[PDB]
Amino acid sequence: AKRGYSFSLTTFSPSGKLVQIEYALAAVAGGAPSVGIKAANGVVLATEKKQKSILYDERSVHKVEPITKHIGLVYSGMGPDYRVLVHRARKLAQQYYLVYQEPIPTAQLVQRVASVMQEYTQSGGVRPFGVSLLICGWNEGRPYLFQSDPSGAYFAWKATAMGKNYVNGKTFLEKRYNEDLELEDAIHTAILTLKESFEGQMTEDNIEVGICNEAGFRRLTPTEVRDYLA
Amino acid sequence: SIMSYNGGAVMAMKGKNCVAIAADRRFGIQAQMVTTDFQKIFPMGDRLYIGLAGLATDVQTVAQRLKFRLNLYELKEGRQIKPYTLMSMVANLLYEKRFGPYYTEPVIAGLDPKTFKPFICSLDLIGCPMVTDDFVVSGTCSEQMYGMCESLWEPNMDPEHLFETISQAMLNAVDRDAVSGMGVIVHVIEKDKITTRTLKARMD
Amino acid sequence: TTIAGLVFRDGVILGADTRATNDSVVADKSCEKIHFIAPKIYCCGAGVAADTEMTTRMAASKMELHALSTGREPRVATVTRILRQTLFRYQGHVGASLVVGGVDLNGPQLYEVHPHGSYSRLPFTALGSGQGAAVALLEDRFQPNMTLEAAQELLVEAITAGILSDLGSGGNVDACVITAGGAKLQRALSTPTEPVQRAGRYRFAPGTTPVLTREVRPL
Amino acid sequence: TTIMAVEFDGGVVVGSDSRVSAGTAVVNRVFDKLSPLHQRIFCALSGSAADAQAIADMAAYQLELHGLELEEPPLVLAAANVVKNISYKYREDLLAHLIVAGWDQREGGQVYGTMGGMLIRQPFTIGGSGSSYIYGYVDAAYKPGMTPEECRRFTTNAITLAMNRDGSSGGVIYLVTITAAGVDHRVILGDELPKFYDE
Amino acid sequence: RFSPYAFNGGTVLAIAGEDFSIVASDTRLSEGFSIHTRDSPKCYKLTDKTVIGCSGFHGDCLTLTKIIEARLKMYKHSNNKAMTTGAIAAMLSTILYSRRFFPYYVYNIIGGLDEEGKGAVYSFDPVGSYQRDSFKAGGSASAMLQPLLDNQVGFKNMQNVEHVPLTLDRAMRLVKDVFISAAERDVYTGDALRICIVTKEGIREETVPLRKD
Amino acid sequence: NQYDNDVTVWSPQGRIHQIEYAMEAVKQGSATVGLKSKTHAVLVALKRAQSELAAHQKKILHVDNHIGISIAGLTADARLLCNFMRQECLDSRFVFDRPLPVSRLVSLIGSKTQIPTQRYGRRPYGVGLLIAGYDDMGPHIFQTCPSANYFDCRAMSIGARSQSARTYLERHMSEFMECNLDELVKHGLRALRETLPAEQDLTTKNVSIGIVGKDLEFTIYDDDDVSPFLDGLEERPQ
Amino acid sequence: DRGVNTFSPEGRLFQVEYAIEAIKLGSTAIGIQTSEGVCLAVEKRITSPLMEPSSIEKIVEIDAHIGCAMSGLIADAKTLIDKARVETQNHWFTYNETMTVESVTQAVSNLALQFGEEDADPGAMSRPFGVALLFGGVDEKGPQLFHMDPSGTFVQCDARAIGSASEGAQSSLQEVYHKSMTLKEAIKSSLIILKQVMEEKLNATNIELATVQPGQNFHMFTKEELEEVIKDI
Amino acid sequence: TQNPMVTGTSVLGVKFDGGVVIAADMLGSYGSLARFRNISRIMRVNDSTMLGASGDYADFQYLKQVLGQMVIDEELLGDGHSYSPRAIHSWLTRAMYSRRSKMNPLWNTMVIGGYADGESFLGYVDMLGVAYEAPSLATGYGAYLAQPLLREVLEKQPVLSQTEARELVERCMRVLYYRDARSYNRFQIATVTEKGVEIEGPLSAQTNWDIAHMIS
Amino acid sequence: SSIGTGYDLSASTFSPDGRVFQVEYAMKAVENSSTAIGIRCKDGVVFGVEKLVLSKLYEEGSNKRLFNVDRHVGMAVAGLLADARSLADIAREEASNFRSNFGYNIPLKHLADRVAMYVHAYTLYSAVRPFGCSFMLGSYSANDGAQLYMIDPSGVSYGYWGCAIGKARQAAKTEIEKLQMKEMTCRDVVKEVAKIIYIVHDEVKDKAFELELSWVGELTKGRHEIVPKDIREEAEKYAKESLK
Ligand SMILES: [Cl-]
Ligand SMILES: [Cl-]
Ligand SMILES: [Cl-]
Ligand SMILES: [Cl-]
Ligand SMILES: [Cl-]
Ligand SMILES: [Cl-]
Ligand SMILES: [Cl-]
Ligand SMILES: [Cl-]
Ligand SMILES: [K+]
Ligand SMILES: [K+]
Ligand SMILES: [K+]
Ligand SMILES: [K+]
């Protein structure tokens, strides 16, 4: 028999800073690098999927996940916490569709998912999520890219990077990224930003990449990743 | 019948880049009439209207509770509601009371924001959506309204002619119903304007 | 409402009419009684229209969620069980009699499920108000391993039988063909009745209607 | 519905008919009313179709877990108790009689009747609407220690006669035989069906 | 459907005097046209000063007496004294009313002594309306016992009778006579008559045989 | 110490200090003695006064017609356990119509007293009881503690200076089984006498006695009802 | 930091022992059980002449035959007093009689250690009551006086004092008590001892006096009546 | 239970010198239909008390396991205490009334025979909570048929030997088989004594049909 | 062996070296209690417990450490006796639930499995403390044969031919290894159980003791019960005279 704690594990310090959120921000900042780019006619999301051993089955688990027909997810930080947010976001997407009979606007999903992240910064007996989410989507004939973080705050991006070397990844994108890209060009600059922080040689198994357009969201097959790696 | 208690008649029609919605103005309890200027058509935004026929309390309740959910939608979303989305919102609202339903059969009529496209639909008392390219009717004189609409409606009607058709369909169907009347209110919806008219209906 | 399911060599075919009746009067002459559940699984709904719609959409939503977590093509056997248990919980108060058919790793499957929660698996079935007519045709002209084309024709015939013979059945006949390669939904596959023609023009010269009050809001 | 279960030395025989009917109309002339609770345990379905199928599923579920916890094939007695318990907990809410028959190492082939939420073990049991017309038959046609094949004749015969008398019973006869070796499932078509006095 | 009640008959009688209280009842327990048992007295000891008589549905009577028995202990552990005749009567009223919407089909009459030593009789209905009186009958033959007591004990409808105070001897014979008359007419009354006498010395029981048909 | 603030915290030695601290509450209370023969069970307790103007505290409490208790420790915890014992005895008579066997009632104490010792925020019962009862198995003397553990005993003493009474009973434990009721109470009184200091002895105001057995139901004698037992006394020797 | 239900190495509850210490800050109250009645006396402790005299109620009526004197945290007391008043009328409704002074005190003593944190209701007590009470009244066992403290322990008293100067008033009652005292001497003694242990002089508006005797009900003394008992200083 | 399914008819009971004897036929009826003609309606509670039950058989089997567990639970303690025949009767009365008051009754009529402390016990329990003690007991139709026989013999001879009680019971089962349409000629006899509970196997009452020729 | 201050106060807190000390301290409570023993014979299981007499005022048979969980199941406990009785109640209810659900006597392995889950549940949270005792479960039938299981404070359960818990669990196990229990009758086993208790018992540290003994085999028809006074005293004399 058990009964949970009813007191907040995230409190205000004398400085006025919620320490556990910034500590959760350290968990994502130390995780594997991820990059997202909004490119006029579509969105691309890419991440480092280096399992650091040849024993692993690279096909079993995925980091780039679909939420619905038109929305995808990538993360930096902890895998287990990310899974919870995926399952919650998939349910929120269906809850919206059952009520309105319309594919959920990306901005509306991120708002609903970020609100779940907010709970774990105030609710009793729980720690915040150690994950920053990268949400892509297509609705009203327009590409969307969003960032959700442990705080529960959300930001809209043209292009951004998170995880290891997120500071060097962003400055790279400031110079490299230009508006009005083609989707196929966006995959290149996504892998290029990922190469800046890699360490090792890139194979189609070492990285994972998903794309979102007017035809919906899908993860690129290992054969498709190999062709861009040249 | 429970629907027969208060009565009422709501009708919607479709035309060339325009939609029309009309209702009777009667509020009455079984034997007698109380009010001549009762409202049954409610605006759910510019260029989108809902008409509600049935029990007067549930007519007012659904309209108020839908406005509650509509305003929250229009605030959370950064947009004005699409006609298909409103239909699904009413459908969800009514079905939530599956085994204790509001005794009203709603009619959505309006033009799609941005895309100009005309839209008309009617629903069950438990929220079953019905989309047509011509007309939808709801009330105690369903059969009378169906008989008029089937004979009068034409594929491509201009705002001038659509008003005349939807009026005559409402006028004569109401004159055969004992629980509907005391004036007819017609809304003609265009991109440029909205035309509101009360007609010289029978007051008996 | 007349709905039928047929099992053939390459897959399954489902049929429905398009008539929805309120009281003893026709409300919708063109409604969709074949429901999307999974890309390769569809369900035919008869009973309370709202119930069939919502129960179906619920299943479809759950099935998509299942597919997403599983990462695999959903099973029709899974859909059937989901439906049963939900419907059983409500003791037949959710008036949904359904014909669910789909293709699996396990092949093509046809199920029928009743509002009380009973299910049965079979090569062919028909539910709804016009089931008698449809079952009659299938019982008469059904052979196993029918070619798709013969199956298409028989199903149409079976549903057509319901349209003409039944008062609560009418409109066009919709068919959905499910094969391992694909699922082709054919709306208005066949239309027995077309009366567009009217002899009189009931038009009104503007001003015929007497108006007491006019108000215009410009936008 | 006519359902029958007969007990012999090696194991048991469970019989059923193929028809479900809604009033005067038949909705399924080919329905298998023999459901397995476990590898060696079967039950025969009667009553409300929905209720019977609902109980069958739960019984199979609980027994599946029971088996794993014991790491042994469930006793038939155990199987019979779960069904009895579900039927009794909701006697007013659920309308079903399930006959549970199977094989276990401890006590061999066994037959249990759970009608009304009671537990009884019998040399053989009949259930359903059709059972009324064969009460006389079974009393005169029963002999102790019938061989598997004799048991099959017995259940087939009884059900055939019930099917012809009963309006709510018809279709083909479904038969299973449970032994230590395995499960034998066979169907008897109308042409194969036994003949008696018809007129 | 299903009826939660059964009629078991039985009549209970109580009379109050200067220093005594009498509770009397038949020993017949019946159901329909059959007799369950001939040995079922309705009188029951609660304290040395108070006796209860229950009639009607025996299922309710058994449960109610057991509740009172438990409530008597609960009171004496909390108040360090025995519950008085008036206090038991006040308690029974609240227990009977707590079942206002699913009542005990029961006719209770309490007989005992007050704090001054004087005889006290409390009459109840199935729901809990009660008062103190000199004499009361309750049950299937209560309408047969009442009018004779109104005439003899209450001196009603009489002109020049000198109004003699009630003695134990006279009341005992009155109790016997009305029950003998009731056993002749009421089918649910018979077998044996048990009389419980409450005095300052305590409870004394007496049995007189009745019609067994 | 930091292993002594909660019942849910085990000491490195393999102990719970909060149970042991609750056991200290029993020792601080005034002494009480329980003993039995083959026919009777007698409880003898020492009443205590905070001041001479205030009356003496209740030590013996009623449970049922066949069961009685003597308390040692916290008053509210004693009354809480007493009400539970009364309720269990009432439930037994309501359902089975027969008195609850002493053995089973004490087992219900053991089950109830255990619950709060294993839950966080809860605490052990700060009272130890001596239970005297009579049933089908004859007379019984039982002992309960803050720790849910209970004992079936021939004679027992708990409270302040109860060791002196414990040693007296241990010498005369073979005497009790053939003892007359009047002789049995005097043995209980003589044990309780050993607990008191040399200056003071048993008086009519500070002695409470409870007796249950084959002859009669549980009865508490306090003031004037106690003097027949005290009279006929062998003088206090050393 | 510890919980509210924590035992000391000594064998006592901390929160209870600390609640006893809260009484040692409250004003002194004295009750005397006479063979012909019970008298209760308490000091009001006036902080300012602006404060209304009859505003402070440290002696209250619970029933027609029961009076109660309070000391310590007054806010906690009136919660217990209302519960005592509810109990008397609940018992009157059920049994058609007046409760004994012992049963009333016992009923209040049941709320004693009914406090805690976990495994409790949303509105359950967090701490004990910082109140000591003197229940004085007349039932069918003659005149009675009872003392109660936060531990729940309640006992009858021939004469008892509780408050800031508890020991000083206890010793003064100890040498000036006969179990055959008259009610005239009873009020006198309580008034004599009260002025000795106080920081302020005895005025007619400074103190409360109450009497419960077999004949008449609980009586709150009026200013004029206090001046007749203070005339005999 | 709102509507009983499989039911059992009259249960008999009469106490002799040094024990009690109970009889009940081995029939479980589904309406008028004789469904199970070899099922036991009597159980042994412990070594002092026994129980025969009328009405719904599923409710009897439920009470059979609850009472069965209670004896098991008591035997585990081994404290020298056991449930007396009166205690079982008292528990059963409280159980039936509790279910009755919840409007969900156990559809049963019980006869409880027992022997303890040299005294014979015979108790009746109804589905509504009606309970009492009698020298002879008969439920259902037995109350109209068998009970008049038992009372008339016990009036002329209050004390019976075990043999006298047995032959009286067999005489009553004969009348019950003749006059009850819901009875059968296969019954059991249970007996409590100083030695304990003894339930005897399938018995048949001797029937005479010579009055079939006395209609001409 | 122990960590102070922080990592040993709660069972919901792991120590740096991956240990739950609250469980380990609860394991110390049983190590302090007197020795409980039990071994599996050819035709059943026999239990034996040394019961240290705290005072001669206590009755002979008080503080029973041998329990009847079910008619066929017996429990032998060592540790905090308060927890032992609650676990005896939990085990009794579990055996009762099995019969109510499945209609026959619970298999001992499953009973041990079920109760061990309840014990384990008290090792995960700060809201509750682990049980401060270890206990043994023994049964016999014609189908399953003789079986013996033991559960400790952590929630671990294993099958045994011979098992001991308490003060001198090591001194007992080495004496059990000497016996050919796979071939021995349970009548012979009782004698050997009694002598190992006497050898294990410390007469110079602990004051005095009583010997508790239990049956569960073919001689008792599969029912768990107490070893009679006649057979026990024969085994006690055997224990005293072979101690030389
Ligand atoms: Cl908390
Ligand atoms: Cl149509
Ligand atoms: Cl049969
Ligand atoms: Cl059946
Ligand atoms: Cl009550
Ligand atoms: Cl104390
Ligand atoms: Cl104080
Ligand atoms: Cl009850
Ligand atoms: K569903
Ligand atoms: K320490
Ligand atoms: K304290
Ligand atoms: K055996």
Side-chain angles (χ1 to χ4, degrees), chain H residues 168-181:
Chain H
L168 216 187
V169 159
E170 286 182 43
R171 275 164 61 193
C172 284
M173 301 305 293
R174 190 183 288 109
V175 171
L176 288 170
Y177 176 73
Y178 288 152
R179 292 293 150 184
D180 190 28

Side-chain angles (χ1 to χ4, degrees), chain E residues 117-136:
Chain E
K118 283 165 173 63
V121 165
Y122 290 91
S123 53
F124 297 77
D125 71 334
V127 187
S129 74
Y130 84 111
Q131 65 161 179
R132 192 178 172 173
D133 34 48
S134 289
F135 53 94
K136 198 67 73 185

Side-chain angles (χ1 to χ4, degrees), chain A residues 175-194:
Chain A
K175 285 162 163 283
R176 188 77 65 170
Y177 168 83
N178 295 69
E179 286 186 57
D180 209 57
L181 295 171
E182 207 83 336
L183 186 58
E184 27 268 304
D185 292 315
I187 288 106
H188 268 286
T189 173
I191 271 86
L192 282 171
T193 316
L194 209 66

Side-chain angles (χ1 to χ4, degrees), chain A residues 96 99 101-102 108 140, chain B residues 73 76-77 79 85 88 114:
Chain A
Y96 190 96
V99 174
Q101 285 279 289
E102 188 188 329
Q108 292 296 307
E140 256 79 39
Chain B
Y73 182 87
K76 288 179 197 180
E77 312 266 334
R79 59 172 173 177
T85 313
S88 298
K114 297 183 290 171

Side-chain angles (χ1 to χ4, degrees), chain H residues 102-142:
Chain H
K102 291 166 191 169
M103 293 293 282
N104 191 230
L106 291 161
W107 212 276
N108 291 307
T109 328
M110 258 80 70
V111 178
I112 302 90
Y115 195 79
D117 293 311
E119 308 297 322
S120 294
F121 175 86
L122 193 63
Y124 176 100
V125 180
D126 217 326
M127 75 166 184
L128 298 177
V130 188
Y132 60 90
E133 288 177 32
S136 61
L137 282 180
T139 59
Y141 262 87

Side-chain angles (χ1 to χ4, degrees), chain H residues 24 26 38 40 42 166 185-190 198-204:
Chain H
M26 297 179 78
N38 201 53
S40 186
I42 303 172
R166 180 183 290 272
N185 213 342
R186 207 166 182 93
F187 71 95
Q188 287 173 122
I189 281 177
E198 193 173 14
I199 299 169
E200 289 177 21
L203 294 170
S204 292

Side-chain angles (χ1 to χ4, degrees), chain B residues 12 19 33-34 70 75 82 84 89 110 116 122 128 130 143 155 178 181 184 198 202:
Chain B
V19 281
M33 150 269 162
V34 184
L70 183 97
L75 287 166
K82 293 179 85 72
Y84 242 101
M89 187 187 280
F116 90 79
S122 66
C128 183
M130 176 163 82
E143 299 171 28
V184 186
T198 69
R202 291 195 70 93

